[PDB]
Amino acid sequence: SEELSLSEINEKMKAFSKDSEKLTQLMEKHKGDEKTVQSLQREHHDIKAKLANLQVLHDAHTGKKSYVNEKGNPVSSLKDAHLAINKDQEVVEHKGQFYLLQKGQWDAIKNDPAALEKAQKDYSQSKHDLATIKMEALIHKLSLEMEKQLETINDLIMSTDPKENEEATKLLHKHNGLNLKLANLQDMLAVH
Amino acid sequence: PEYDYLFKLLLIGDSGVGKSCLLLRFADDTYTESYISTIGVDFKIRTIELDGKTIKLQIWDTAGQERFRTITSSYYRGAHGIIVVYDVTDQESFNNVKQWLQEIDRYASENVNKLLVGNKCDLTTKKVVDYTTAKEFADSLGIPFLETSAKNATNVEQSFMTMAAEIKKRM
Ligand SMILES: Nc1nc2c(ncn2[C@@H]2O[C@H](COP(=O)(O)OP(=O)(O)OP(=O)(O)O)[C@@H](O)[C@H]2O)c(=O)[nH]1
Ligand SMILES: [Mg+2]
């Protein structure tokens, strides 16, 4: 699986922001209809989370975040990564206890149970979210591939030569085969 | 294969209401009872003649099943008209027309044309959605409305012609 390129990340974030803005207008328009308003809010929350997940990959591509393994040592690629952390963060680990905290602050949290518990929580949440981002990344990548097929299925089918149209027809089959895989990816995501 | 107009249409609505059968009746003049759920989209092209003008229609038939509606925003791009289909023998499919319409609002162009189709009107004794209740709804939103039978071909040609006529006059 090739990662999403920066152009792909930007194109998705742009579509999600646009969709988010439209959901907001719609909530305003249906105010008073508690069923539709509730469903629109559920959609908007979902789009917002996907946007935030794309922003993490954006930060990673621009150096505001760095990929690291479970111990917090730097790694090259996303497939190798266990967390993406900020410039000012570090991991502390011992015998299966992992802490994510601000760089230099181990002295400050060492004797503080609330800060300890927070650092463990942040580590685990960060690990799980990176797993979510990887899965969404694959879904986004696959979806962008199917989208660019539509543009192409179109002109091909426009043509009258039984060659380019019979092509379009096999392109449509392939497109639909991808939709089967995309749906199954969406299923796993929901489990995680 | 020259034309004076070129319109992109979508069919949307619940699984099993007859979107694909409407597509196949209109574009291929065929009907079959064998069924496979539409996995993503199907696409047919057909030309009609309206007010002396040749209209090439690009018709996209979408999946009713939510698990296959991953890239719907992409199907709406450049759509001139959307046909919302329900099954006249199935109340839930009609109840869901409200949500389908809200999907149009969300993904389609602001000025997109809409058409409500109640399919399977050949099933006269099985019909549970009254014509007047359907048409009152359509009318309440300025949406044209027809009842069709993909199986017997009733109103199928007329439906696409009515859609093409709505779009032609807003150009
Ligand atoms: N009696 C009658 N049955 C019909 C008519 N149209 C469709 N059906 C039946 O309804 C079934 C569903 O038709 P489809 O067009 O495949 O339904 P769909 O909306 O495309 O469903 P999905 O692809 O799952 O979204 C068909 O297999 C037919 O048996 C009709 O005009 N009359
Ligand atoms: Mg179908």
- CATH code assigned at A160: 6.10.140.990
Considering only CA atoms, which residue is closest to atom 1 of ligand 1?
B120
Largest interatomic CA distance in chain A: 76
- Find all residues with CB under 8 Å of A57, minimum gap 6, and list them: A3, A4, A9, A78, A133, A137
In order, the DSSP letters of B62-101 are E--SGGG-TTHHHHHTT-SEEEEEEETT-HHHHHTHHHHH
For residue A72 the two structure tokens come to: 């917090």
Long-range contacts of A23-27 (CB under 8 A, 24+ apart): A23/A47, A23/B106, A26/B102, A26/B105, A26/B106
Nearest-angstrom CA–CA distance, B72 and B38: 13
Nearest-angstrom CA–CA distance, A95 and A182: 38
Contact A176 B102 (CB under 8 A): no
Q: Which class for B93: exposed (0-12), middle (13-18), buried (19 or more C-beta within 10 A)?
A: buried
Residues A67 and A43 in one domain: no
- DSSP label at B107? H
For residue B38 the two structure tokens come to: 């539409």
Pick B39's closest partner by Cβ from A36, A154, A180. Answer: A180
Considering only CA atoms, which residue is closest to atom 22 of ligand 1?
B15
Query: Based on C-alpha coordinates, what's the Rg of chain A?
Result: 21
Contact A186 B70 (CB under 8 A): yes
Structural domain for A101, as ranges: 63-192
- Find all residues with CB under 8 Å of A29, minimum gap 6, and list them: none
Q: How far is the CA of B12 from the centre of ligand 2 (A)?
A: 9
Q: Which residues of A126-137 are buried (b: 16+ CB within 10 A; e: fewer)?
A: bbebbebbbbbb
Residues A6 and A81 in one domain: no
CB B4 within 8 A of CB B49: no
Laid out side by side, the sheet with B145-148 consists of B41-50, B53-62, B5-12, B81-87, B113-119, B145-148
Domain boundary among A38, A62, A86: A62
B118 C-beta closer than 6 A to ligand 1: no
Residue B42: Cβ within 10 Å count:
19
Nearest-angstrom CA–CA distance, B104 and B113: 10
Residues A42 and A68 in one domain: no
Residues A95 and A167 in one domain: yes
The angle subtended at Cα B108 by Cα A45 and Cα A34, nearest 5°, is 45
> What end-to-end distance do the CA atoms of chain A give, in Å?
19
Domain boundary among A62, A84, A104: A62
HSE (side-chain half, CA atoms, 13 Å) at A141 = 14
For residue B84 the two structure tokens come to: 């919302």
Nearest-angstrom CA–CA distance, B7 and B163: 10
Residue B161: Cβ within 10 Å count:
17
For residue A129 the two structure tokens come to: 């979210």
- Find all residues with CB under 8 Å of A80, minimum gap 6, and list them: A67, A69
- Find all residues with CB under 8 Å of A26, minimum gap 6, and list them: A40, B102, B105, B106
Largest interatomic CA distance in chain B: 44
CB B65 within 8 A of CB B71: no
Number of domains in chain A: 2
Smallest Cα–Cα separation from B107: which of A78, A15, A162, A117?
A15
- What technique was this entry resolved by? X-ray
For residue B19 the two structure tokens come to: 């979107």
Helix/strand number for chain B, H first, E second: 6, 6
For residue B151 the two structure tokens come to: 């199986």
**Hey, what amino acid is at A75?**
V
B154 touches chain A (CB under 8 A): no
Nearest-angstrom CA–CA distance, B83 and B85: 6
B17 C-beta closer than 6 A to ligand 1: yes
Residues A98 and A176 in one domain: yes
Nearest-angstrom CA–CA distance, B8 and A117: 56
Partnered with residue A65 across adjacent β-strands are A86
HSE (side-chain half, CA atoms, 13 Å) at A134 = 18
Residues A24 and A7 in one domain: yes
Calculate the CA B115 to chain-centre distance: 7
Calculate the CA B17 to chain-centre distance: 10
- Find all residues with CB under 8 Å of A150, minimum gap 6, and list them: A175, B74, B75
CB A58 within 8 A of CB A3: no
In chain B, the domains with their CATH numbers are 1-171 (3.40.50.300)
Q: How far is the CA of B60 from the centre of ligand 2 (A)?
A: 10
- CATH code assigned at A4: 1.20.58.90
Domain boundary among A34, A62, A90: A62
CB B58 within 8 A of CB B26: no
Nearest-angstrom CA–CA distance, A75 and A65: 12
Specify the residue for token string 């609002």: B105
